[PDB]
Every structure is written in structure tokens, then in C-alpha cells.
């Protein structure tokens, strides 16, 4: 038994809810929240801008030190950093940016990072401002992640489409 409430169960391990991931993380304080990161950990907008704003920019300060030491992530890659006031840890995962001509096949590699964590609160990777089809992202998630993932969909019309079209 865990603290997540109000989710629809899609599969043995994947759950979904219409929720603001920021508000969900603040309420639940999960072990792991996933950020929709870019390779530079520049948290300007979308999920990343919203998570970073909720940390009062502490996520960005920590991220800039990480990049100064390690250089950029790979597309499809991840790093574990602090969750600040939102979670114990933040798993920063880089989904492909379709708007940058970045291979959609890298979305499966991105989701494989979730398998290193038993339970996660996450957005749909490469959705929103990363330009991928969120229906596709949900399918890759279900077919790739084996650990328990609680998906936060900000768009209610999209949430309802994802549920109503789910095979
Ligand atoms: O709400 C979310 O969590 C992510 N939002 C989207 O992925 N929106 C797309 C919906 C379909 C058309 C393009 C934008």
C-alpha cells in the first residue's frame, strides 16, 4: 500500500490521473518524482519549469552545479538529484524533443530509466512542449516500465482521450 489517491489503474503497474504533477508531488512527497528534463537541465518551461519554480529555483541551482561537473545528459538518459520540497529524489529524464529532430525511438530508452526505481510519480515523457504524441508516449510507457508508475496528465481533455483510447 502507498499514498497515491484517485488514480485509474491501466495495467498491473501503470496508473494515471488528471493532476498537476507539482500539486501531486507537494501532497504525496513521493520517493521519486520524474522531471521532463532536457540535456542541459535548463528547467525553463513545461513540467521542468513548473517543478523548478515550486523549489524556488533550488532545482536549477543544483542542476547547474551537476552540469558544470558532468556535462550534459544524453537524450534517453537520466540523473538522480534532490527532490527538494517535492520528493525525496528527482529523476531527471530526457525524452526526445520532436521539435529538435531527436529520434522518437529514444523514448523507449528514456522510459527504461524508470525501471531503476520501484515507485515513481511521473509525467508522460516527450509530451507537452517536447512535441510527441502523448497516446504514443503512454503506449511506450506501458510496454517499457515494469516498476510502479503513477502518471500525472495536466490536460483533462488529453487525460480523457488517453483513458478512452487505451488498449
Ligand atoms: O497534459 C499533459 O500532461 C501533456 N500535454 C500534451 O501532451 N498535450 C498535447 C496533447 C495533444 C496535442 C498536442 C499537445
Curated annotation (Swiss-Prot):
It is found in: Host endoplasmic reticulum membrane. Residues 1-167 form the Macro domain. It catalyses: Thiol-dependent hydrolysis of ester, thioester, amide, peptide and isopeptide bonds formed by the C-terminal Gly of ubiquitin (a 76-residue protein attached to proteins as an intracellular targeting signal). It comes from the Viruses. It is a multi-pass membrane protein. Inhibited in vitro by GRL-0617. May form homohexamers. Interacts with N protein. Responsible for the cleavages located at the N-terminus of the replicase polyprotein. Participates together with nsp4 in the assembly of virally-induced cytoplasmic double-membrane vesicles necessary for viral replication. Antagonizes innate immune induction of type I interferon by blocking the phosphorylation, dimerization and subsequent nuclear translocation of host IRF3. Also prevents host NF-kappa-B signaling. In addition, PL-PRO possesses a deubiquitinating/deISGylating activity and processes both 'Lys-48'- and 'Lys-63'-linked polyubiquitin chains from cellular substrates. This is Papain-like protease nsp3. The chain holds residues 1025 to 1191 of 7096 of the full protein.
